[PDB]
């Protein structure tokens, strides 16, 4: 049966964690950015190519080129549910007064999805979280 993947995220910028109810605030060398990926409906023990992208955002609209990208190879935990940490490290060249949002993609290394329904997987499982208006993935530099 085909896996039904879902991901949400929570960003931490410097010492400051965002949440469903408030974006993270960073006090005016670079900003340490860590994104937590909350996943369900992945395949236990399978490896995923995870790509995080940091964008400047203005009123829930992405502006300009990515400020940073980070990739990792992470393994799905028990029942294909759990949390991953994607550490971007220090991100240089962010601007005081500006807001940033994290986008995430995870693509399985193995074929985990039977897209043509012959009961044999032939497609990668791909999950995305690309919401420019998600305050839990957003931080502002004060």
Applying CB under 5 A, the residues found at the interface with Ca ion are: 114, 116, 118, 120, 122
Check the annotation: does 79 bind a ligand.
Answer: no
Q: Do the Cβ atoms of 47 and 110 come closer than 8 Å?
A: yes
> Residues 89, 92, 95, 101: is their CA dihedral positive or negative?
negative
8 binds Na ion (CB under 5 A): yes
Size of the site for Na ion (CB under 5 A): 3
**Residue 7 structure tokens:** 């991901």
Partner interacting with residue 8 (select from Ca ion, Na ion, none; CB below 5-8 Å by kind): Na ion
Check the annotation: does 98 bind a ligand.
Answer: no
Residue, CB closest to Na ion: 136
The dihedral region occupied by 100, where left means phi > 0, alpha psi between -120 and 50, and beta the remainder, is beta
Cβ closest to Na ion, residue 19 vs residue 123: 19
Interface positions, 21-50, toward Na ion (CB under 5 A): none
Tell the smallest beta-carbon distance from residue 34 to Ca ion (Å): 37
In whole angstroms, what separates CA 49 from the centre of its chain? 12
Q: How far apart are CA 69 and CA 61, in angstroms?
A: 18
136 binds Na ion (CB under 5 A): yes
Residues contacting residue 133 through CB under 8 Å, at least 6 positions apart: 60
Cβ closest to Na ion, residue 8 vs residue 16: 8
* Known binding-site positions for Ca(2+): 114, 116, 118, 120, 122
Q: Footprint of Na ion on this chain (CB under 5 A)?
A: 8, 10, 136
């Amino acid at each position: 049966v085909n896996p039904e993947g879902k991901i949400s995220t929570t960003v931490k910028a410097d010492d400051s964690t965002a949440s469903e109810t408030a974006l993270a605030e960073v006090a005016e060398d670079g900003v340490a950015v860590v994104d937590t990926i909350h996943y369900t409906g992945l395949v236990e023990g399978k490896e995923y190519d995870v790509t995080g992208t940091l964008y400047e955002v203005k009123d829930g609209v992405v502006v300009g080129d990515a400020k940073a990208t980070k990739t990792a190879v992470l393994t799905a935990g028990k029942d294909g549910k759990g949390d991953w940490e994607l550490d971007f490290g220090t991100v240089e060249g962010l601007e005081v007064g500006k807001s940033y949002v994290v986008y995430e993609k995870a693509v399985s290394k193995e074929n985990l999805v039977d897209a043509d329904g012959d009961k044999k997987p032939e497609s990668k499982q791909e999950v995305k979280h690309e919401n420019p208006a998600d305050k839990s993935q957003t931080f502002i530099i004060k």
